[model samples]
Target chain A: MRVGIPTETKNNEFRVAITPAGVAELTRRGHEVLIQAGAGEGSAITDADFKAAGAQLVGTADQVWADADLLLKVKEPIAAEYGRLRHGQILFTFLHLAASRACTDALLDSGTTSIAYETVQTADGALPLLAPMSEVAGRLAAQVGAYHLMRTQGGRGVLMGGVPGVEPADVVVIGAGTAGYNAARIANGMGATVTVLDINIDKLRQLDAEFCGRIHTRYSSAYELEGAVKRADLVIGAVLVVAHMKPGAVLVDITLFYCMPASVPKTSTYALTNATMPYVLELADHGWRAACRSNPALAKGLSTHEGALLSERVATDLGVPFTEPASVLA
Target chain B: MRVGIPTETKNNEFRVAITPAGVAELTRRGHEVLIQAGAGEGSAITDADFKAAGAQLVGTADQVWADADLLLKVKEPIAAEYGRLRHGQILFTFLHLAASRACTDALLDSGTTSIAYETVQTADGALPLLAPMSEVAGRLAAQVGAYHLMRTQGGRGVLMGGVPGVEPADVVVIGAGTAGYNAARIANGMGATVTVLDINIDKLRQLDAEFCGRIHTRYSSAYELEGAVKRADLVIGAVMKPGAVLVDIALFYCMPASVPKTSTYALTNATMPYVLELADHGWRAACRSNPALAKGLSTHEGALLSERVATDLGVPFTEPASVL
Candidate 1:
């Protein structure tokens, strides 16, 4: 089987679909990997690096797509690349067609077997593909908050870890998910007084046991959230608040306020590639049919088939007929 | 006994000589505390807070100086404040008179009984008053270092606490004293991979045990210092380095660099108990009673009591017991 990797053309897309090591892994599995020349440059990966890793470098995305049966990408193909999608070629990427109709139409019209990275969930209902970015965004949220807390950056001039005879700065985190928990880990590690508020008491109990009562937990009641925000020097709104923040208080919102990527292009690319690499190998080895039959999560992630959409959500949104992956693959 | 609290006149000196609680303690012991109005304005301590604590407000520094038997201050007196000094007034503060000939001469001329906080040492060779500020400065170094580690602040943009599948930032602390130890404590606490270097193996052992081997330790050989520094994202120089630090790496030097002014509450908090002791007993009695404080008598009645200061200043040394 031949595998294809194209350089991402989307704005601010610095991450490559495949790392040099990932190329090495795929090429060693008896698969010919065609990488677009300089595809990994944004991630500091070079052509020679990929070549040394046994990847056959192609001159352009058109040539790479023409030579391979499997197509791997970081983001969904935009309108300009719509012509490149072809019938019988397996198009694998984070194709969130639920929000875009033109892309959905292109996938169905081209007969490209498309898969969305976000919809891929395990037997236990955990998103392995998306967790890596959430962790980075959460940790980065705390780092950014600390930077803005300095007086030079117009902060309160209070140190996170206060000295003897002095008080440490107060930090408040809203939410108990991946982003908020990672934010709490660093802020609390820095010796600042930390309080994590969430609507879920179950997750709060798990966080409490993990931290050994060092990190304070609150129910995030309407009144309690206001009180915590008013006193906080730094607030990591991962799960999600504003308006209640005190003067000189910093707020780094992850999800509750904004719905977009706070992820570093390089890191996100690396994370996404790792999560998708195994599925990529599985698809390349036995083809998507057998791979999907073996992994229900991969089948669940499949978004399009020959002239049809696989997801009920995307199908309903587009006012198009919905079909199951089993029926379409059959 | 009358205790006087004067507003610190040093440039950027925000800390007051006493807290409201300190004033209350002195007044409770039948000591009349003459506090200059707005003495604690810089520390956000109000005059009403002082009054509520039984302090008698005075309009001028002149009145506060004349009405008191003892004077407490945060910084040393400048030339403008020299006129306020007189015979038999016991003065206690962080008076670095050894560095200033004019202040030393004024103390001698006015017959002032003076004690320098920096010179005060215990049997274990520790400075209690200076320790609090050093602790604050050390801990603050890591906070400031973490701040500048952001790319917006001209840093590498690496998070101090890196997530799973990413590398955490490397932090190197120089010298494992009060400053270096505290700096390591904060940086390590922040989830950064921290390494502290000191020449003293004994002190390093103590730190290793305290941190339970979580913090890495290395001997501060010339080669090791350069290698460790070059690799660090944030280099905290508590005991002290420079020139070896990487480009974009932040250097927060406690003694190995520049300093700050926002040490109001803690400085006052640490000094209050000592100030109360002096107010409760006469200078001669108090100096003789506290063994740790005896060496603090840096000067008294035109004579140098501490030979340590006298030698450091190249002045004549007088025995403290003789003066008492």
Candidate 2:
């Protein structure tokens, strides 16, 4: 099996699809690793590292693209790499199809088996791959909010944790999901009074027990949400909001915002791609069809294949007809 | 004194500049309050509420625009409301002049004294009016990060707080300021291994005392910052990477670090006096009415005065008195 690791070409993206350590394992297991020269440069992994790991250091991206059975990457292929996709090859990376019609169309046209890092969900509905970046984004919410809250950023002049004599600011989290809960926790840790509201009482119960009264949990009611928003210095929207409640509100959607490019070097290149190596090997060993059959989680990640849009949500979002993964795989 | 409350024209903007309670206070203080009909409808405040609070409910926006000495609003005037500005009339709202050349041009042409809520800085450089929104933005940083972390959102699929058996994710917050600190706190509470990095020893000490060792506090070095970022599931940008636009620098500029590093007086106070002088003296007499306002004037009668605004728009800079 020939696995290819291309040098990331996205602007400000510095991560390679696979690390030398990953290459070493694949090579030791009788699999051939084709890595573009200097692919690991951004990750501080030298060409010598890949050579020592028994990787075939190809001189050109064209060679790796044409030869490898499986292609690994940190981001979606841009225009320069678009023409390189071949039939029957497996492309694994973060392909945000909902946002980019062009990228999705490219994948559909390529006839390559493509898997998205974010869409791979566990049986319990947990996202195994997207978790790392989601965690980064969830935590960044509080930090960005606090910065914008400063008197200078057109925010309320009050500090998150007030001085000794003053009362702390109030933070309201509108959802009890991963993002909402984290926002509440961070706001609470900052010494701000935090209230979390969610439609799910079970999730609220979980939070209630976790905070141990340090943070307040409430059932989401429009009236209650309005009151909470009115008193809050910061309102983190894990859920939706009322238009009238938005005038003085500072709203930010981390889901829509990309991770900072500077942070992408470590988080995406080293950490993110590193997490995808095992799966890449799995796909390489058994082929994508067999690998998906063996691992349900990986099957969930099969976004598009052979002109079929396998993900229902993505197809719906793109206004394309949806096809089941089973039928496509069959 | 006549204080007018106009209905907000911005779509999805439901807030009124002054509530019924505010109108009541103003009317009690011998100031007549005129409100445009249905101004408070979005806020669920009825015209009856304003009337009960001693406000005279005017029939049309034109009536309020023509009669009011001091006009209060939630947002800046859009194109539809642009022609309503009268000479010497005071328009108080969130006029983000840097973003809108057209609005500034309209205000200049109308000869109406415009005061921005965002620029109302206190003596200590505190922007009292803009604080609420800023706070909201700061807290939102974490919330947004968490949302994108979801598997469906193209993020690394991970729950913020791990299940009982699973270990919590790593959250690294760079910078020790209000935003950074809040981010660290929330990440910590979410049951993550939180690390905070900062170059400032004083702030580090403060966070050290506050967190009481719940979070790992480290001196920010290039090596340390990189290692932390590698280990981190989340890295908050209170500061940026080397050769990158430093988050600290971006935030410093964002918060208006200098009250008036280059200017003669604060833009807020200048705006207030410009409004006061315009109301006291008419626009024709208000050209060189107040020294501070005259210096702050950007344009008048098809001429630009303030060199900063003139340079920005590439318009010819003329003396304040020459605008007349």
Candidate 3:
């Protein structure tokens, strides 16, 4: 099996699809790993490092794309990479086909066996590949939100940790999910008066108890959300509920719905590689059909395969004909 | 005294000249502040906040520039503001007159008494006005450098804090100045092995003692610099000394020489307000004779006002009150 790793082309995407360890693993398993030069630069992986790990360092994206049987990436293939996809090539990456029509169209048009990392759910419905990026997005929500709220950054000039005489800024967190939870935690740590609102009363209660009532927990309602958003200095939206407010108030949205890769390689790349390695090995050992049959979880990730749309929701969203994975495999 | 705050026109420049706090101070002191409506928007300040702070929010930049006796800004006025400068009006901001021939020529043509924040030194020779932005740039040097060092961002793909088994990156810091110190501190915090080099042995010793030998301190020499830079993954240059380097190494420059307005409103706004005291006390008198105001003058009455700026730019100097 020849596996290819190309440099992520998306702006500010710093994580690669695989690490040197992953390369070494694949190489030891009697598979050839082809990595594009400077592919791991964003993750702090050098060409020399990849070469050291027994992977062949390809000079260009075209070379890696052309030679490899399996293509690995951090993000969905943008327009620039659309032409590079060939029929029957197995592309494994975070393909949010439901949200993007162009990506779904490209995958279908290419007749490629496309696997999405976000949809690669475990037996118990845990998004193993998605969790790592969710954690990164969760932390970045607080970090980026705090920076933009600064006066010099065109924020309200309200300090996160208010002076002795002055009061701290009001921080509103909209969900009890992982992203929301981390945002609330960091916002509270920054000394802002935090309020976390969620429709789930139990989750709200859990958060309240977790924070020892330092952060205010509210029952999420349209009326309550409006009032909170209006009064709040920084509103972090972790869910779907949108809040339109005064010009002074900054609304931070970290839905992670389409978690674009931005964190360092060691954190995002390594975690993702760790999670996807099992499936990757299975795919390499057996063909896509046999691998999908062996691991039902990986079959769930098949958005498009054999010139057919596998995911019903993605097909419906893109208005394309749906074909079941089992039917396609059979 | 009528003070004006105009919107900075430079691309990627979001900082404003004065905050609402500065406006309040001026208002309390019986000085009227005229602020352009969207001037504070980039800095996250609303018109209502400036209005609440006792500033009359004007609709246009021209009105603020045309009306005010004193002009406050974060950046030096670009070409758009060339005609806005009036004779006898006090311009206080980070004006890198030595670097910008166009700005210097415009100031001379307008005969404005421009005071630069970079050259506003204290009696003890500390850059009082420039220190805040220097601190900001210093910290940002490490933060930006580390982010760009990621493999996905076209970097060597070596992690800042290498994995448990792997070796950490080598961070070579040139000059043990404020910017270099902060850069070294941040890079070290990010788990990189930092080596700070300086021509000043005292400063290098101070940094060594400060980091408690966590970082390697070395006496700066061309030979030593070449060796360290070659070995380094990220090199932070804090001073003006330029280096021609190999392709693979990431060279980080943090020279706060001109200090041309990059920090958020809170730092630059408040810092400038702190140093504008002499200019605020009757512009004509301060322009004529006040030594404090006299020290910051980059260009007044055509020829170079500051002898330092004059010599640095190699511009011919004229005596005081050359045009006035």
Candidate 4:
């Protein structure tokens, strides 16, 4: 099987899909990997590193797109790559088809089998690829939030970990999901007074068990959020949460918030590569249809195959007709 | 006794000469106290605080200076306050006569008996008034340095106290005095790796035992200072004892000038009691009683009095024994 890697072409996109280790692993599996020249340069990986890992470099995205059996990317194929999309070549990447009509139309028009990383879900309902970036965002939020909390930095000047006589800063984290949970954990570790609020009782219960009583987990009501946010020195929103904040308070808009879409780019890039590696390996080594059949999560990841919508969820989201993966792939 | 409190006229000098408490004490002792209308306002002490304490509020520094027998101030009188200086009136302040020849000449020409607060050393050799501001300066250095270490704040983006997995920032302080000690103490409290350097081994010994060796104390040689300063993220210099002092400023108040809120309160607290003593007994009588106040005498009746100032003086200087 031939695997091609291209430089992420979107504006503000610095991440590459594969690392040198991933290249080495593919080569060890006897899979030929063709990388676009300097594809990993944005991620600080040199062309020498790719060559050292037994990978051959092609001159352009056009060459990589034309030759490979499978093409891996960080973002969806933009307008430039719309004509380059070929039939029978598996397009494996973030392919956010739910949000783009033109991209969905391009994949269908070219008969390209597109897989979306975001729609990938295991039996217990975990987004393995998405969760890694969320964890990075959450951890970076606490770090950045603490930096801005300094008085000399024009903050409220409240120390995250206040001394013996002084009380530590109050940190309010809205939503007790993956991002909020990680935010609360780091804030608690930094000796801040952390309180997590979520709408889901099950998620709140899981957090309560995880942290015991060190972190105050609460059900997020408008009244509760209002009171907690007003007194908070730093609020990590994982909407109305921002309005109630006091003067000079620091807010990290991390989820459904502004600090989204690769806020910590370098960290997110490396983390995404790590998260997407095993799945990329499976697709390359065993072929896309064979790998999807073996792994239920990869099967669920199949969004559009052979000119029709395969993922039921994304088809419903875009109000397009749904074609089951069983009918298309089998 | 007629005592007047004037607003400090120096650039970036926000501390008032005396607080409201000083006004109440002065009035209680049969002294008429006059204050510039909003003198204490800089120190966040209200005009109402002075009036409630039985002190009269004067509209201008000119009004307070013209009528009062004793004028209390925080900084050395700038050129603005130079003309206001009256003959026979005792101007008790941090008259850093060691630094300024013009200020010294102005005091002499005005015939004002000026007493400096910095030169007021006790028998045990403690600068009581100066030590208070030093503590404030050192503590503020640590806080400000830590604030700037954040990446978001355009710093090295290092956390003072790093998380469980990461290492904290390295903070180097050159000086072992009242300022450096407080700077290291606050930086250590913030969980930074603090190292203090000084030429004095005795100060190092005191810090080594005081911190129980949490803070690394080393002898400040050129080799050692270069090594520590190179790797350190934040450096605090209370370099009062720098080898072959390039410039020995009588008052080092850069940090104190920016932090007027806490700095002014700490300064006024230390100076208030001495201000009352000088105000109540008059300069000559107070010097006659308290030797500390006598040593503070910088210029008297158009003559240089402090031996240190006179030695530093290029022109004609007086022996205090002859003047006294």
Candidate 5:
């Protein structure tokens, strides 16, 4: 079986379909790899490097695309290269069709079975390769946010950390998923007021149990969002798509409400509200769920969202409305 | 001798100087008080409270200005109210005359003795009154910064906190004065990798001692600032005026660089960079300083740079070369 490795022709793209290490892995599986010459140039990988990994280098990208059973590249083929793609080839790359209609049409017309690198799901439901980049982008967002809020820049000029007699800044994190969860942790650690809004009761629960109730997790709604924004000194947005394992909730959209599913499994409609007391009860119940909420990160032999989630929840609950939301250990 | 309190005519001004408690203290010192009926409305204080604190009610702000030895309010008098100011009257408010040539001219024309509330110094060198608002504004600035950094908002779309196996955001704070130090503390609390930059080794040493090496303190220079901005995910400017314990960095800027004694005493000159960084650095530093800098909430507290200085320093540094 031959695998095609194409050069990334997309504007400003520097990533490649495969690394030398990945090529070595494929070679171990008894597969002949056909890499386009200079395909790995963007990620600073040379053709010699891929060849050294027991792979053959084709003279042109077209030869690799036409010859191989599976075609792989960092980006989708542009209009110029679309005509060159052979039918019935398995195309693998970040095919963000929604963002590019041309790419989507090309794949459909070519009859290529495509799997996107950005959307690929792994065992235990993790976006393995995407996680590292998402984390970097997520944390960097908070850093930039703080920078723009300084007074000299003509902003409201409130400090996130209060003086001995002053109050701390309020940080509102939209979505209690991976990115949002991390934003809450950083904001909490900075001695700012932190609020993590999520539609998932289980995620909220797991957060409570893990951080010992340091952050505040709200059952997300428009009303709750309004209050959170008005009171927030800092707002972080991180949302993921609807997942199969937990079909009840979604985490993105800093301004819009995340609708809860009408039914949980067979019959019970989840009754949710933003009422302070009811939500508090929800949080308490979620705390119990934290113990039961399977530490996926750990059970799957990884550091999970429990620490991030719990810490955020714990900080919010322990601190005053606008005080520092950091946990003791945090 | 009598003191006259005036109505704050500024449309959006929501604060008042000399609370009822302050009135009581003044009255106790044998000064007669004449407070305008609705002067304290913005601060949630009532005329009744002022009366209870030994202040007499005046019919209008004009009457208060006419009769009182001193006029008190939160901000500079509006154009309409400025006409009422009289000679020799003590005018007290937060007068930002450095930026307000009109206000300075008005005060000079009125021949009134003026004292700025923001400039008042306390024993421990705190601007006891201004300290309250600085804290509020400082914290709020950071909060707002977070909001704008979201991907939907056209930012780099990075998170402040990190995930398992992911590193947290990096925050760079300029200056180590009250505002900068506090900003660094908050950024650190948010689990950011914070670097506190300043020229004061003593202050940096103090910070290192206090934070137990939780923050990185660097001797900031034009070169250092350029690097810091390149690698920094966030920055907070908190430099203050030199010499005086209270913010009074103006004396430094006003000092003639040609004069040795004046230049030596002037501390603001020590804070300003001789040359600016690139325009992106300028834009970023300004944006990072926006919450305070944009609104003049915080002073630039450094030496005054010429336009030539800014232009010369405005070229962008490319990657790896720019990374802090």
Candidate 6:
């Protein structure tokens, strides 16, 4: 098996799909590797570094995509590279498709095993590729928030850490999960008034015990969510999608709101025959959020494409049929 | 002095400004306290409890505000109560006036010594009244975030904790201070990936060491701030202001594109000076996201306000002549 590494097209992306060290590992496993000229330069991986690691340099992106059994890159394929996809080839990279419909259509049309770095799932349903970066984003949220609170930041000019006899700022964190907890942690440590909300009693109890009764925890309902949002000095959206479940189609009338409503509510249709998801349809129309799909598990010690294989197992269980390696036409 | 307690007017506001126990403390200090019929009910305190604690019950909202030298309530005043302020009376509560110009105008017109619950300063500049509620709010932030990640919520359907073989959800905290750290501690214990950021290198080093590398500490800069927001599945905004020096009016315009855009910005300006604020202008305009203010420190602790009276020490260093 051969893997191709292409020069990045994204203006700011500096990371390569495979590092020199990664190339060595692949070569050691009897897999051939080709690195396009100047491909590793942005990531500081010199041509010599790739050569010493047993990877051969190719002339262009065309050759790399044409010859390699798998293609790896930091960013998704640009429009120019869209035509390079071939059936049976595995495409691996970060594909933030929510903001790119063209990319989504391109990938779906290729009929190849395209696994997105952003959507890669593990054995237990964690997005390994997505986790590292989110951790980066979560920590920065509070810092930006605090900076904004300073008088210099055009804020109302109250200090988070009050003077010897002054008052500190109040911080409100929405959602008590990972993002919420991290935000709360920083706000609480700074002696600011911090309020965190969630619906889980056990999670709240754990929060109470961990902070030694310093930070406040509240049970969240719809009313609480709206109330908290309105009063919050900082509101972090730590909301995440659970299992990917497709809800049934339903038609109802909401003359008060938009008739199309921009998007339809989703509910999972799990293990049902003939797409009979009336329960899901009814709950969704009423805006009862629920995902009935089989859980997407995080695969331990798996990389991008490897993680997709694990996620496919759960999808298969839900009667979503798929073609394995032998079923490929090419 | 006589203080009045009014029933909360906010739709979901349930907490009262003072518990019956707090009323007892105020009464012990020789000040009279008047409570409206159901002011303490939300806190599970009964009118009988307030009466037993030496509070006089008032029947109407008018009598409570009219007869009292001081007014205390849990929430910010709504439009209905704007005209009730009396001149020279001390109004104490969470006056998030930045979001409410009408309330600010009403308070100023009434000429009340508006000592906000959020603005009461301590010797260390801590908000005493706001702290108790803040503590609740901070921890609950993490609790609420967890539910949103659950499959039941309209989230990614990921659990905070995975099975023995699975990886946990990633949690990012934007500050390394009190709230961010507390949130991280619980999230880490629950088997999620936690990352924390702060401007102070010393604080960041301390957190990195304390978490034993379980949590990642990153330097906070505008560049990093933008990158982090883009990838964070769950981002918590735990920012705070240090003290009142008057907010810089221009910073709000540049903040929208870097974070969760509008939703993630939280400002805790509890009790800024209302009169000067209007002339300065456009502070809140920059917050494309919803922004608010809290009370100041002076109103939280009565002793702080009386410090000048107690010490006889005149203001010396600061340029502000009124109360430096």
Q: Give the number of the best model, judged by lDDT.
A: 1
**Candidate 6: tens digits of C-alpha lDDT, residues A253-277:** 1100001100100111011100112
For residues A1-330, could you state the per-residue lDDT of candidate 5 as single tens digits?
577778767664545566666667667756667888877654335777778886788888768888786666656778788787665455555555556545555655565544454544445777654554444444544554444334333223334444453344566787877667766666566565677888888988887876788888888888887777766655767775621111111122322222101111000000111111221122123321231233222122111121121222222443312212122112
- What fnat does each of the candidate structures reach? 0.28, 0.06, 0.10, 0.01, 0.25, 0.00
Which portions of model 4 show Cα errors greater than 4 Å? A1-330, B150-155, B199-202, B240-254
Q: Indicate the docking level reached by candidate 3.
A: incorrect
Q: What is the CAPRI rating of model 6's predicted complex?
A: incorrect
Candidate models: Cα lDDT each: 0.76, 0.66, 0.72, 0.74, 0.51, 0.51
Model 1 agreement with the true structure over A1-330: per-residue lDDT tens digits: 889999999875666778877889988879889998888865546788889997889888899888688989888998799999988788888888978899998998888887788888898888877887777777667656665565445555456666666677788989998888888887887777889999999989989999998889999798999988888888887773236565556777871222223234444566667777889988999898888888899888889988878899888876888887778766
> Which regions of candidate 2 are displaced past 4 Å?
A11-16, A19-24, A37-60, A98-101, A240-249, A255-265, A268-271, A306-324, A327-330, B1-324
Instruction: Please give each candidate's TM-score.
Output: 0.73, 0.53, 0.63, 0.62, 0.51, 0.41
Chain A TM-score vs. truth, each candidate: 0.90, 0.82, 0.88, 0.88, 0.59, 0.61
- Over A77-178, each residue of candidate 3 has an lDDT whose tens digit, in order, gives 888999989886899988888888887888888888888888887888788776655555554465456545554445554545442333557888989776
lDDT of candidate 1 over B123-179, digit per residue (tens): 889988788777767766776676555544444445565556656768898888888
Least accurate 10 contiguous residues by lDDT in model 4 chain B? B242-251
Docking class of 2: incorrect
Of 1 and 3, the candidate ranking higher by lDDT: 1
lDDT, ranked from best to worst: 1, 4, 3, 2, 5, 6
- Model number with the top DockQ: 1
Model 2 chain B: ten consecutive residues of lowest lDDT? B257-266
Point out where model 3 deviates above 4 Å.
Answer: A1-19, A26-125, A136-241, A245-259, A262-268, A278-330, B1-16, B34-47, B56-91, B95-114, B139-176, B181-236, B240-276, B279-294, B297-305, B312-324
Off by over 4 Å in 1: A1-20, A31-116, A150-153, A227-233, A240-250, A255-273, A283-330, B1-20, B30-117, B230-232, B240-265, B278-324
Question: Tens digits of per-residue lDDT for model 3 on B25-130?
Answer: 8888788889998886754567888898799999899899898888888789998889999887778888988887788989988888787777766667777666
Mind sharing the TM-score for model 4?
Answer: 0.62
Report RMSD (Å) for each prediction in the order shown: 6.2, 11.6, 7.7, 8.1, 18.8, 16.4
